[PDB]
mmCIF file of C-alpha atoms and ligand atoms in Angstrom:
data_model
loop_
_atom_site.group_PDB
_atom_site.id
_atom_site.type_symbol
_atom_site.label_atom_id
_atom_site.label_comp_id
_atom_site.label_asym_id
_atom_site.label_seq_id
_atom_site.Cartn_x
_atom_site.Cartn_y
_atom_site.Cartn_z
ATOM 1 C CA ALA M 2 -109.955 -28.522 -31.844
ATOM 2 C CA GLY M 3 -107.315 -30.560 -33.668
ATOM 3 C CA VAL M 4 -103.917 -32.134 -33.039
ATOM 4 C CA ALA M 5 -101.831 -28.938 -33.680
ATOM 5 C CA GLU M 6 -99.825 -27.675 -30.685
ATOM 6 C CA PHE M 7 -98.718 -24.060 -30.393
ATOM 7 C CA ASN M 8 -96.242 -22.385 -28.059
ATOM 8 C CA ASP M 9 -97.001 -19.262 -26.068
ATOM 9 C CA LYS M 10 -96.044 -17.006 -28.952
ATOM 10 C CA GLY M 11 -98.411 -18.825 -31.341
ATOM 11 C CA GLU M 12 -95.724 -20.702 -33.274
ATOM 12 C CA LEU M 13 -96.573 -24.225 -34.448
ATOM 13 C CA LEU M 14 -94.590 -26.903 -32.589
ATOM 14 C CA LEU M 15 -93.066 -29.745 -34.674
ATOM 15 C CA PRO M 16 -95.814 -32.344 -35.004
ATOM 16 C CA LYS M 17 -94.970 -35.540 -33.161
ATOM 17 C CA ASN M 18 -94.991 -38.972 -34.788
ATOM 18 C CA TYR M 19 -96.590 -37.619 -38.010
ATOM 19 C CA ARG M 20 -95.045 -40.553 -39.960
ATOM 20 C CA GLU M 21 -97.734 -42.631 -38.162
ATOM 21 C CA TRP M 22 -100.425 -40.416 -39.728
ATOM 22 C CA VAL M 23 -102.276 -41.269 -42.944
ATOM 23 C CA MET M 24 -100.041 -40.921 -46.026
ATOM 24 C CA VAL M 25 -102.335 -39.496 -48.714
ATOM 25 C CA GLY M 26 -99.994 -39.120 -51.660
ATOM 26 C CA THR M 27 -96.364 -39.255 -52.698
ATOM 27 C CA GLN M 28 -94.838 -37.111 -55.418
ATOM 28 C CA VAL M 29 -91.522 -37.145 -57.258
ATOM 29 C CA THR M 30 -89.684 -34.206 -58.791
ATOM 30 C CA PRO M 31 -87.612 -35.011 -61.902
ATOM 31 C CA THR M 42 -84.297 -35.332 -57.480
ATOM 32 C CA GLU M 43 -86.820 -35.282 -54.603
ATOM 33 C CA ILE M 44 -89.615 -37.397 -53.183
ATOM 34 C CA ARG M 45 -92.389 -35.765 -51.178
ATOM 35 C CA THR M 46 -94.617 -37.636 -48.799
ATOM 36 C CA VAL M 47 -97.959 -36.024 -47.614
ATOM 37 C CA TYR M 48 -99.712 -36.932 -44.320
ATOM 38 C CA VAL M 49 -103.103 -35.980 -42.856
ATOM 39 C CA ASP M 50 -103.584 -36.467 -39.103
ATOM 40 C CA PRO M 51 -105.742 -39.603 -38.416
ATOM 41 C CA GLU M 52 -108.758 -37.831 -36.850
ATOM 42 C CA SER M 53 -108.983 -35.337 -39.751
ATOM 43 C CA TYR M 54 -108.625 -38.246 -42.172
ATOM 44 C CA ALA M 55 -111.492 -40.076 -40.375
ATOM 45 C CA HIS M 56 -113.646 -36.980 -40.751
ATOM 46 C CA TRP M 57 -112.672 -36.744 -44.446
ATOM 47 C CA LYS M 58 -113.790 -40.374 -44.999
ATOM 48 C CA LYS M 59 -117.218 -39.517 -43.589
ATOM 49 C CA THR M 60 -117.698 -36.075 -45.190
ATOM 50 C CA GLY M 61 -115.236 -35.314 -48.011
ATOM 51 C CA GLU M 62 -114.317 -32.211 -46.012
ATOM 52 C CA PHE M 63 -111.334 -30.947 -44.019
ATOM 53 C CA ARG M 64 -112.464 -30.404 -40.469
ATOM 54 C CA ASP M 65 -111.555 -27.385 -38.421
ATOM 55 C CA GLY M 66 -108.229 -28.357 -36.822
ATOM 56 C CA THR M 67 -106.938 -30.356 -39.824
ATOM 57 C CA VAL M 68 -103.134 -30.692 -39.960
ATOM 58 C CA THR M 69 -101.193 -31.732 -43.081
ATOM 59 C CA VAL M 70 -97.436 -32.447 -43.245
ATOM 60 C CA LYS M 71 -95.255 -32.604 -46.325
ATOM 61 C CA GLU M 72 -91.954 -34.405 -45.789
ATOM 62 C CA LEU M 73 -89.140 -33.914 -48.295
ATOM 63 C CA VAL M 74 -86.521 -36.590 -49.097
ATOM 64 C CA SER M 75 -83.618 -36.971 -51.490
ATOM 65 C CA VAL M 76 -83.700 -39.999 -53.768
ATOM 66 C CA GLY M 77 -81.660 -43.189 -53.337
ATOM 67 C CA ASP M 78 -80.789 -45.403 -56.330
ATOM 68 C CA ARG M 79 -81.436 -49.149 -56.269
ATOM 69 C CA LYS M 80 -79.627 -51.493 -58.682
ATOM 70 C CA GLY M 81 -81.133 -54.992 -58.792
ATOM 71 C CA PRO M 82 -81.988 -57.537 -57.533
ATOM 72 C CA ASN M 86 -83.586 -51.123 -60.844
ATOM 73 C CA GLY M 87 -85.339 -48.269 -59.036
ATOM 74 C CA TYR M 88 -85.456 -45.225 -56.789
ATOM 75 C CA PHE M 89 -86.298 -45.077 -53.077
ATOM 76 C CA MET M 90 -86.590 -42.514 -50.222
ATOM 77 C CA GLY M 91 -83.094 -41.377 -49.239
ATOM 78 C CA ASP M 92 -82.264 -38.753 -46.634
ATOM 79 C CA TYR M 93 -84.784 -36.493 -44.933
ATOM 80 C CA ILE M 94 -84.105 -32.949 -46.194
ATOM 81 C CA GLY M 95 -87.215 -30.894 -45.333
ATOM 82 C CA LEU M 96 -90.570 -30.610 -43.594
ATOM 83 C CA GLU M 97 -93.546 -28.316 -44.226
ATOM 84 C CA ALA M 98 -97.023 -28.271 -42.638
ATOM 85 C CA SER M 99 -100.380 -26.576 -42.966
ATOM 86 C CA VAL M 100 -103.050 -26.087 -40.301
ATOM 87 C CA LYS M 101 -106.710 -25.195 -40.746
ATOM 88 C CA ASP M 102 -108.283 -23.294 -37.826
ATOM 89 C CA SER M 103 -111.315 -20.952 -38.364
ATOM 90 C CA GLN M 104 -110.626 -19.283 -34.965
ATOM 91 C CA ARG M 105 -106.808 -19.033 -34.767
ATOM 92 C CA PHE M 106 -106.488 -18.216 -38.492
ATOM 93 C CA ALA M 107 -109.691 -16.249 -38.917
ATOM 94 C CA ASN M 108 -107.808 -13.761 -41.109
ATOM 95 C CA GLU M 109 -105.925 -16.188 -43.404
ATOM 96 C CA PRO M 110 -107.322 -17.430 -46.795
ATOM 97 C CA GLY M 111 -109.460 -20.511 -46.123
ATOM 98 C CA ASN M 112 -108.317 -20.252 -42.471
ATOM 99 C CA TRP M 113 -105.071 -22.136 -43.346
ATOM 100 C CA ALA M 114 -101.631 -21.293 -41.969
ATOM 101 C CA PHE M 115 -98.457 -22.535 -43.710
ATOM 102 C CA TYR M 116 -95.083 -23.458 -42.186
ATOM 103 C CA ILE M 117 -91.548 -24.502 -42.864
ATOM 104 C CA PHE M 118 -89.704 -26.492 -40.229
ATOM 105 C CA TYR M 119 -86.625 -26.923 -42.437
ATOM 106 C CA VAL M 120 -85.582 -27.090 -46.105
ATOM 107 C CA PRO M 121 -82.224 -27.433 -47.887
ATOM 108 C CA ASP M 122 -80.455 -25.111 -45.615
ATOM 109 C CA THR M 123 -82.770 -23.272 -43.499
ATOM 110 C CA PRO M 124 -81.803 -25.233 -40.338
ATOM 111 C CA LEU M 125 -84.527 -27.046 -38.363
ATOM 112 C CA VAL M 126 -86.631 -25.058 -35.866
ATOM 113 C CA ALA M 127 -88.572 -26.613 -32.932
ATOM 114 C CA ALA M 128 -91.360 -24.126 -33.614
ATOM 115 C CA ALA M 129 -92.354 -22.349 -36.838
ATOM 116 C CA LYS M 130 -94.068 -19.016 -37.567
ATOM 117 C CA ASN M 131 -96.952 -18.862 -40.112
ATOM 118 C CA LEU M 132 -95.727 -17.706 -43.496
ATOM 119 C CA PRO M 133 -96.961 -14.771 -45.658
ATOM 120 C CA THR M 134 -99.693 -15.555 -48.205
ATOM 121 C CA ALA M 135 -97.494 -14.636 -51.215
ATOM 122 C CA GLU M 136 -95.016 -17.290 -50.138
ATOM 123 C CA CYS M 137 -97.425 -20.249 -49.647
ATOM 124 C CA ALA M 138 -101.199 -19.720 -49.444
ATOM 125 C CA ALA M 139 -101.380 -17.821 -52.767
ATOM 126 C CA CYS M 140 -100.339 -20.813 -54.851
ATOM 127 C CA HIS M 141 -102.518 -23.213 -52.859
ATOM 128 C CA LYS M 142 -105.697 -21.107 -53.011
ATOM 129 C CA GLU M 143 -105.088 -20.450 -56.714
ATOM 130 C CA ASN M 144 -104.430 -24.022 -57.792
ATOM 131 C CA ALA M 145 -105.423 -26.632 -55.243
ATOM 132 C CA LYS M 146 -108.536 -28.656 -56.057
ATOM 133 C CA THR M 147 -110.091 -28.773 -52.585
ATOM 134 C CA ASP M 148 -109.962 -26.172 -49.811
ATOM 135 C CA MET M 149 -106.289 -25.258 -50.398
ATOM 136 C CA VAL M 150 -105.084 -28.895 -50.405
ATOM 137 C CA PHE M 151 -103.857 -30.502 -53.683
ATOM 138 C CA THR M 152 -106.264 -33.437 -53.474
ATOM 139 C CA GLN M 153 -106.134 -33.775 -57.295
ATOM 140 C CA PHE M 154 -102.822 -35.592 -56.617
ATOM 141 C CA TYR M 155 -103.798 -37.677 -53.528
ATOM 142 C CA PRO M 156 -105.541 -40.905 -54.521
ATOM 143 C CA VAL M 157 -105.879 -42.171 -50.901
ATOM 144 C CA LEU M 158 -108.232 -39.224 -50.223
ATOM 145 C CA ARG M 159 -110.124 -39.851 -53.477
ATOM 146 C CA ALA M 160 -110.937 -43.476 -52.653
ATOM 147 C CA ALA M 161 -111.796 -42.460 -49.051
ATOM 148 C CA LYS M 162 -114.204 -39.680 -50.172
ATOM 149 C CA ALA M 163 -115.780 -41.517 -53.161
ATOM 150 C CA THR M 164 -116.178 -44.922 -51.441
ATOM 151 C CA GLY M 165 -115.445 -44.584 -47.674
ATOM 152 C CA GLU M 166 -112.563 -47.034 -48.134
ATOM 153 C CA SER M 167 -108.881 -47.019 -47.117
ATOM 154 C CA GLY M 168 -107.800 -49.778 -49.494
ATOM 155 C CA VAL M 169 -108.993 -51.906 -52.402
ATOM 156 C CA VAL M 170 -112.090 -53.983 -51.649
ATOM 157 C CA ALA M 171 -113.018 -57.118 -53.627
ATOM 158 C CA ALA T 2 -101.301 -63.216 -33.030
ATOM 159 C CA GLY T 3 -101.395 -60.394 -35.574
ATOM 160 C CA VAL T 4 -103.884 -58.540 -37.761
ATOM 161 C CA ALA T 5 -103.905 -61.099 -40.664
ATOM 162 C CA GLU T 6 -107.270 -62.781 -41.328
ATOM 163 C CA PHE T 7 -107.525 -66.134 -43.081
ATOM 164 C CA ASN T 8 -110.502 -67.963 -44.554
ATOM 165 C CA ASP T 9 -111.334 -71.577 -43.816
ATOM 166 C CA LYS T 10 -109.023 -72.825 -46.540
ATOM 167 C CA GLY T 11 -106.076 -70.828 -45.146
ATOM 168 C CA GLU T 12 -106.076 -68.123 -47.822
ATOM 169 C CA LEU T 13 -105.188 -64.587 -46.717
ATOM 170 C CA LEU T 14 -108.177 -62.219 -46.849
ATOM 171 C CA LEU T 15 -107.608 -58.732 -48.354
ATOM 172 C CA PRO T 16 -106.337 -56.589 -45.491
ATOM 173 C CA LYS T 17 -108.816 -53.897 -44.527
ATOM 174 C CA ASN T 18 -107.948 -50.204 -44.356
ATOM 175 C CA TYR T 19 -104.196 -50.893 -44.826
ATOM 176 C CA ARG T 20 -103.768 -47.352 -46.264
ATOM 177 C CA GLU T 21 -104.255 -46.252 -42.612
ATOM 178 C CA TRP T 22 -101.227 -48.363 -41.623
ATOM 179 C CA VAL T 23 -97.691 -46.991 -41.299
ATOM 180 C CA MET T 24 -96.147 -46.175 -44.699
ATOM 181 C CA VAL T 25 -92.488 -47.180 -44.354
ATOM 182 C CA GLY T 26 -91.110 -46.409 -47.791
ATOM 183 C CA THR T 27 -92.080 -45.455 -51.314
ATOM 184 C CA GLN T 28 -90.213 -46.553 -54.417
ATOM 185 C CA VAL T 29 -90.328 -45.533 -58.068
ATOM 186 C CA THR T 30 -89.505 -47.653 -61.100
ATOM 187 C CA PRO T 31 -88.031 -45.755 -64.075
ATOM 188 C CA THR T 42 -93.510 -46.101 -64.782
ATOM 189 C CA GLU T 43 -94.674 -47.286 -61.335
ATOM 190 C CA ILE T 44 -94.793 -46.069 -57.757
ATOM 191 C CA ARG T 45 -94.846 -48.572 -54.909
ATOM 192 C CA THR T 46 -96.028 -47.752 -51.437
ATOM 193 C CA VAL T 47 -95.102 -50.109 -48.478
ATOM 194 C CA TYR T 48 -97.155 -50.373 -45.243
ATOM 195 C CA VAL T 49 -96.541 -52.180 -41.940
ATOM 196 C CA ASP T 50 -99.561 -52.773 -39.686
ATOM 197 C CA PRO T 51 -99.535 -50.293 -36.717
ATOM 198 C CA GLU T 52 -99.072 -52.852 -33.902
ATOM 199 C CA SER T 53 -96.114 -54.504 -35.691
ATOM 200 C CA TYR T 54 -94.681 -51.043 -36.342
ATOM 201 C CA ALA T 55 -95.040 -50.207 -32.604
ATOM 202 C CA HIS T 56 -93.160 -53.387 -31.757
ATOM 203 C CA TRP T 57 -90.476 -52.496 -34.338
ATOM 204 C CA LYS T 58 -89.997 -49.063 -32.691
ATOM 205 C CA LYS T 59 -89.334 -50.772 -29.358
ATOM 206 C CA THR T 60 -87.205 -53.706 -30.583
ATOM 207 C CA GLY T 61 -85.935 -53.318 -34.166
ATOM 208 C CA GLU T 62 -87.624 -56.658 -34.844
ATOM 209 C CA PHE T 63 -90.631 -57.929 -36.797
ATOM 210 C CA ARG T 64 -92.994 -59.548 -34.353
ATOM 211 C CA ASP T 65 -94.732 -62.822 -34.979
ATOM 212 C CA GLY T 66 -97.917 -61.807 -36.818
ATOM 213 C CA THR T 67 -96.324 -58.919 -38.766
ATOM 214 C CA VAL T 68 -98.180 -57.983 -41.973
ATOM 215 C CA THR T 69 -96.666 -55.879 -44.778
ATOM 216 C CA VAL T 70 -98.532 -54.581 -47.858
ATOM 217 C CA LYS T 71 -97.041 -53.293 -51.080
ATOM 218 C CA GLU T 72 -99.437 -51.213 -53.167
ATOM 219 C CA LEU T 73 -98.653 -50.595 -56.834
ATOM 220 C CA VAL T 74 -99.702 -47.436 -58.726
ATOM 221 C CA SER T 75 -99.193 -46.004 -62.188
ATOM 222 C CA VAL T 76 -97.678 -42.533 -62.369
ATOM 223 C CA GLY T 77 -99.560 -39.295 -63.069
ATOM 224 C CA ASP T 78 -97.795 -36.269 -64.601
ATOM 225 C CA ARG T 79 -98.091 -32.813 -63.042
ATOM 226 C CA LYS T 80 -97.312 -29.672 -65.070
ATOM 227 C CA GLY T 81 -96.992 -26.539 -62.925
ATOM 228 C CA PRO T 82 -98.019 -24.574 -60.956
ATOM 229 C CA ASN T 86 -93.421 -30.063 -62.793
ATOM 230 C CA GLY T 87 -93.636 -33.524 -61.223
ATOM 231 C CA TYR T 88 -95.022 -37.030 -60.891
ATOM 232 C CA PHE T 89 -97.728 -38.272 -58.516
ATOM 233 C CA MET T 90 -99.615 -41.506 -57.632
ATOM 234 C CA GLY T 91 -102.041 -42.314 -60.450
ATOM 235 C CA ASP T 92 -104.274 -45.370 -60.650
ATOM 236 C CA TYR T 93 -104.102 -48.353 -58.321
ATOM 237 C CA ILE T 94 -102.833 -51.296 -60.403
ATOM 238 C CA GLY T 95 -101.681 -53.955 -57.905
ATOM 239 C CA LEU T 96 -101.421 -55.193 -54.332
ATOM 240 C CA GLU T 97 -99.032 -57.667 -52.694
ATOM 241 C CA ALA T 98 -98.619 -58.657 -49.024
ATOM 242 C CA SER T 99 -96.387 -60.698 -46.766
ATOM 243 C CA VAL T 100 -97.229 -62.269 -43.405
ATOM 244 C CA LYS T 101 -94.868 -63.561 -40.733
ATOM 245 C CA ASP T 102 -96.265 -66.377 -38.557
ATOM 246 C CA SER T 103 -93.920 -68.931 -36.840
ATOM 247 C CA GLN T 104 -96.901 -71.306 -36.306
ATOM 248 C CA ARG T 105 -98.958 -71.013 -39.525
ATOM 249 C CA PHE T 106 -95.830 -70.769 -41.717
ATOM 250 C CA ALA T 107 -93.552 -73.020 -39.705
ATOM 251 C CA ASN T 108 -92.261 -74.531 -42.959
ATOM 252 C CA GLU T 109 -91.631 -71.329 -44.974
ATOM 253 C CA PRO T 110 -88.234 -69.471 -45.014
ATOM 254 C CA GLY T 111 -88.196 -67.037 -42.084
ATOM 255 C CA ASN T 112 -91.837 -68.065 -41.452
ATOM 256 C CA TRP T 113 -93.019 -65.545 -44.116
ATOM 257 C CA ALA T 114 -95.797 -66.184 -46.629
ATOM 258 C CA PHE T 115 -96.110 -64.062 -49.798
ATOM 259 C CA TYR T 116 -99.249 -63.066 -51.725
ATOM 260 C CA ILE T 117 -100.616 -61.354 -54.766
ATOM 261 C CA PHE T 118 -104.089 -59.866 -54.606
ATOM 262 C CA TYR T 119 -103.833 -58.408 -58.120
ATOM 263 C CA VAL T 120 -101.269 -57.129 -60.642
ATOM 264 C CA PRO T 121 -101.502 -55.823 -64.220
ATOM 265 C CA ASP T 122 -103.971 -58.361 -65.290
ATOM 266 C CA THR T 123 -104.320 -61.020 -62.837
ATOM 267 C CA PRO T 124 -107.793 -59.831 -61.698
ATOM 268 C CA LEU T 125 -108.372 -59.037 -58.005
ATOM 269 C CA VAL T 126 -109.129 -61.905 -55.594
ATOM 270 C CA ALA T 127 -110.879 -61.488 -52.196
ATOM 271 C CA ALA T 128 -108.512 -64.105 -50.790
ATOM 272 C CA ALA T 129 -105.000 -65.106 -51.886
ATOM 273 C CA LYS T 130 -103.008 -68.353 -51.636
ATOM 274 C CA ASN T 131 -99.366 -68.274 -50.391
ATOM 275 C CA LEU T 132 -96.933 -68.302 -53.283
ATOM 276 C CA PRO T 133 -94.025 -70.722 -53.993
ATOM 277 C CA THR T 134 -90.601 -69.725 -52.633
ATOM 278 C CA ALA T 135 -89.014 -69.477 -56.119
ATOM 279 C CA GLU T 136 -91.585 -66.852 -57.037
ATOM 280 C CA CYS T 137 -91.237 -64.528 -53.991
ATOM 281 C CA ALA T 138 -89.424 -65.661 -50.831
ATOM 282 C CA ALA T 139 -86.220 -66.628 -52.694
ATOM 283 C CA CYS T 140 -85.431 -63.073 -53.750
ATOM 284 C CA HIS T 141 -86.390 -61.640 -50.358
ATOM 285 C CA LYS T 142 -84.334 -64.092 -48.278
ATOM 286 C CA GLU T 143 -81.396 -63.656 -50.663
ATOM 287 C CA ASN T 144 -81.357 -59.869 -50.781
ATOM 288 C CA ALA T 145 -83.419 -58.201 -48.086
ATOM 289 C CA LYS T 146 -81.466 -56.534 -45.284
ATOM 290 C CA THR T 147 -83.648 -57.568 -42.343
ATOM 291 C CA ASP T 148 -85.673 -60.754 -41.864
ATOM 292 C CA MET T 149 -86.889 -60.910 -45.492
ATOM 293 C CA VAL T 150 -88.046 -57.259 -45.567
ATOM 294 C CA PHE T 151 -86.126 -54.682 -47.690
ATOM 295 C CA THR T 152 -85.536 -52.307 -44.781
ATOM 296 C CA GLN T 153 -82.407 -50.965 -46.552
ATOM 297 C CA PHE T 154 -84.933 -48.906 -48.580
ATOM 298 C CA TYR T 155 -87.382 -47.875 -45.791
ATOM 299 C CA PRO T 156 -86.151 -44.805 -43.920
ATOM 300 C CA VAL T 157 -89.250 -44.598 -41.644
ATOM 301 C CA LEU T 158 -88.188 -47.943 -40.106
ATOM 302 C CA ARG T 159 -84.564 -46.783 -39.823
ATOM 303 C CA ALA T 160 -85.407 -43.668 -37.807
ATOM 304 C CA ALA T 161 -87.878 -45.710 -35.694
ATOM 305 C CA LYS T 162 -85.286 -48.434 -34.889
ATOM 306 C CA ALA T 163 -82.231 -46.141 -34.438
ATOM 307 C CA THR T 164 -84.011 -43.407 -32.420
ATOM 308 C CA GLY T 165 -87.530 -44.603 -31.408
ATOM 309 C CA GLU T 166 -88.969 -41.708 -33.425
ATOM 310 C CA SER T 167 -91.689 -41.427 -36.092
ATOM 311 C CA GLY T 168 -90.636 -38.011 -37.377
ATOM 312 C CA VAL T 169 -87.887 -35.403 -37.137
ATOM 313 C CA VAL T 170 -87.281 -34.093 -33.617
ATOM 314 C CA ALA T 171 -85.610 -30.730 -32.914
HETATM 315 C C1 HEC O 1 -97.701 -29.530 -51.466
HETATM 316 C C2 HEC O 1 -97.741 -28.981 -50.172
HETATM 317 C C3 HEC O 1 -98.346 -29.518 -48.944
HETATM 318 C C4 HEC O 1 -99.165 -30.842 -48.857
HETATM 319 C C5 HEC O 1 -100.641 -30.498 -48.501
HETATM 320 C C6 HEC O 1 -101.383 -29.774 -49.622
HETATM 321 O O1 HEC O 1 -101.879 -28.635 -49.400
HETATM 322 O O2 HEC O 1 -101.511 -30.326 -50.752
HETATM 323 C C7 HEC O 1 -98.075 -28.632 -47.942
HETATM 324 C C8 HEC O 1 -98.485 -28.694 -46.454
HETATM 325 C C9 HEC O 1 -97.306 -27.540 -48.522
HETATM 326 N N1 HEC O 1 -97.139 -27.796 -49.856
HETATM 327 FE FE1 HEC O 1 -97.218 -26.244 -51.305
HETATM 328 N N2 HEC O 1 -97.640 -27.575 -52.903
HETATM 329 C C10 HEC O 1 -97.863 -27.195 -54.212
HETATM 330 C C11 HEC O 1 -98.270 -28.379 -54.980
HETATM 331 C C12 HEC O 1 -98.629 -28.473 -56.488
HETATM 332 C C13 HEC O 1 -98.237 -29.524 -53.972
HETATM 333 C C14 HEC O 1 -98.597 -31.001 -54.237
HETATM 334 C C15 HEC O 1 -97.740 -31.523 -55.398
HETATM 335 C C16 HEC O 1 -96.353 -31.979 -55.008
HETATM 336 O O3 HEC O 1 -96.025 -32.104 -53.807
HETATM 337 O O4 HEC O 1 -95.524 -32.228 -55.930
HETATM 338 C C17 HEC O 1 -97.842 -28.908 -52.702
HETATM 339 C C18 HEC O 1 -97.732 -25.908 -54.682
HETATM 340 C C19 HEC O 1 -97.074 -24.836 -54.082
HETATM 341 C C20 HEC O 1 -96.612 -23.608 -54.731
HETATM 342 C C21 HEC O 1 -96.807 -23.339 -56.264
HETATM 343 C C22 HEC O 1 -95.945 -22.202 -56.882
HETATM 344 C C23 HEC O 1 -96.127 -22.801 -53.751
HETATM 345 C C24 HEC O 1 -95.405 -21.443 -53.910
HETATM 346 C C25 HEC O 1 -96.141 -23.553 -52.495
HETATM 347 N N3 HEC O 1 -96.762 -24.750 -52.743
HETATM 348 C C26 HEC O 1 -95.651 -23.134 -51.259
HETATM 349 C C27 HEC O 1 -95.736 -23.795 -50.057
HETATM 350 C C28 HEC O 1 -95.213 -23.328 -48.790
HETATM 351 C C29 HEC O 1 -94.410 -22.002 -48.619
HETATM 352 C C30 HEC O 1 -92.977 -22.252 -48.087
HETATM 353 C C31 HEC O 1 -95.535 -24.250 -47.852
HETATM 354 C C32 HEC O 1 -95.226 -24.244 -46.347
HETATM 355 C C33 HEC O 1 -96.286 -25.313 -48.507
HETATM 356 N N4 HEC O 1 -96.380 -24.996 -49.835
HETATM 357 C C34 HEC O 1 -96.803 -26.428 -47.899
HETATM 358 C C1 HEC O 2 -90.969 -55.249 -52.160
HETATM 359 C C2 HEC O 2 -91.964 -56.118 -51.677
HETATM 360 C C3 HEC O 2 -92.784 -56.019 -50.461
HETATM 361 C C4 HEC O 2 -92.647 -54.906 -49.378
HETATM 362 C C5 HEC O 2 -92.151 -55.551 -48.051
HETATM 363 C C6 HEC O 2 -90.714 -56.062 -48.124
HETATM 364 O O1 HEC O 2 -90.479 -57.281 -47.899
HETATM 365 O O2 HEC O 2 -89.774 -55.260 -48.387
HETATM 366 C C7 HEC O 2 -93.637 -57.084 -50.464
HETATM 367 C C8 HEC O 2 -94.704 -57.478 -49.418
HETATM 368 C C9 HEC O 2 -93.366 -57.857 -51.668
HETATM 369 N N1 HEC O 2 -92.356 -57.237 -52.355
HETATM 370 FE FE1 HEC O 2 -90.848 -58.349 -53.356
HETATM 371 N N2 HEC O 2 -89.480 -56.727 -53.381
HETATM 372 C C10 HEC O 2 -88.197 -56.780 -53.891
HETATM 373 C C11 HEC O 2 -87.520 -55.514 -53.586
HETATM 374 C C12 HEC O 2 -86.072 -55.084 -53.947
HETATM 375 C C13 HEC O 2 -88.568 -54.681 -52.853
HETATM 376 C C14 HEC O 2 -88.386 -53.259 -52.282
HETATM 377 C C15 HEC O 2 -87.912 -52.327 -53.405
HETATM 378 C C16 HEC O 2 -89.014 -51.782 -54.285
HETATM 379 O O3 HEC O 2 -90.218 -51.928 -53.982
HETATM 380 O O4 HEC O 2 -88.687 -51.178 -55.346
HETATM 381 C C17 HEC O 2 -89.752 -55.540 -52.769
HETATM 382 C C18 HEC O 2 -87.668 -57.864 -54.554
HETATM 383 C C19 HEC O 2 -88.346 -58.942 -55.119
HETATM 384 C C20 HEC O 2 -87.840 -59.872 -56.130
HETATM 385 C C21 HEC O 2 -86.398 -59.757 -56.736
HETATM 386 C C22 HEC O 2 -86.135 -60.547 -58.049
HETATM 387 C C23 HEC O 2 -88.795 -60.824 -56.304
HETATM 388 C C24 HEC O 2 -88.817 -61.966 -57.346
HETATM 389 C C25 HEC O 2 -89.970 -60.438 -55.521
HETATM 390 N N3 HEC O 2 -89.629 -59.327 -54.794
HETATM 391 C C26 HEC O 2 -91.204 -61.087 -55.481
HETATM 392 C C27 HEC O 2 -92.282 -60.784 -54.685
HETATM 393 C C28 HEC O 2 -93.552 -61.481 -54.672
HETATM 394 C C29 HEC O 2 -93.900 -62.666 -55.624
HETATM 395 C C30 HEC O 2 -95.113 -62.349 -56.532
HETATM 396 C C31 HEC O 2 -94.327 -60.896 -53.728
HETATM 397 C C32 HEC O 2 -95.761 -61.249 -53.303
HETATM 398 C C33 HEC O 2 -93.554 -59.826 -53.111
HETATM 399 N N4 HEC O 2 -92.329 -59.795 -53.722
HETATM 400 C C34 HEC O 2 -93.980 -59.002 -52.102
#
């Protein structure tokens, strides 16, 4: 259905060019910035329906923080991690909300080309317990809010 | 050439669906988060050349900061401002680097549907004095760095 690619053993392959996807929110930990992307076709469907289609892929990219002085602030430093989630009613028929969760790398677990779906206690439990909308933390993603509430991807006069 | 649209009097119209463009960096002021977008065709050209094509449009979107407690962090709150820049060797033949700068709204100047190019002392002066690359602060935008240095829009194994 969606953009997710899996190898023969069912592991999720590193999404390609996900930084060209739709950035839906950015968060800061008071040390790290996190950037969240939704693949463009799933975002288009969201705009029309306020729902995550079957096949939806999200990516959370982790960065350290750079310090700017003049001409003061913080900015995205080095890439230090990458997580993803994939919704698939068929492939993940037996997972909560049909979502699978993945780590490609974090402060040292080295990068893998392909990732295995993680146990529910590790990832899905928190999401299904706390996320506003279908196991995604849309309460923190104002791009999605404006898209769902108004069909827009930007301010309109 | 590019995606910029101008009205009859030469004012820049609010870009449409710019939140679907390529987010190249996010910055935090220690109070505000700023999100920076480059239109997809100009980003594609950047990937191939490490240069900003004639017609390049950038957008800087300003947000207040929300506070997350559990299950601690900061996230993008309310939209509070929007600036843009446009490179055009023909239309802005007489501007530094051929870039024009714009405010659509900020903490109260109300939103305009169309914006007039701002004086160089107000905007272009700082950019041309301090920005790393052709009046854009690419020193702070790691998406562009990885795209220029490696042709990639994401981590590759
Ligand atoms: C962000 C996240 C995302 C982005 C998409 C989404 O579902 O919102 C993914 C793909 C992911 N994480 Fe999850 N996570 C939590 C919260 C509050 C946010 C948004 C706020 C922010 O980024 O600052 C998330 C919450 C939690 C959590 C609470 C105790 C747990 C244990 C996890 N997340 C665990 C995981 C994963 C296990 C390694 C994993 C692959 C995640 N999250 C993916
Ligand atoms: C960010 C900005 C952007 C994003 C594209 C880019 O050229 O990098 C635009 C379109 C824009 N501003 Fe500029 N600005 C400055 C810096 C350091 C950054 C990136 C870091 C961050 O966001 O935290 C910018 C610097 C300055 C500055 C230094 C004294 C001045 C006076 C300005 N900027 C002024 C303006 C504008 C006048 C109202 C205007 C429309 C801008 N910037 C647009």
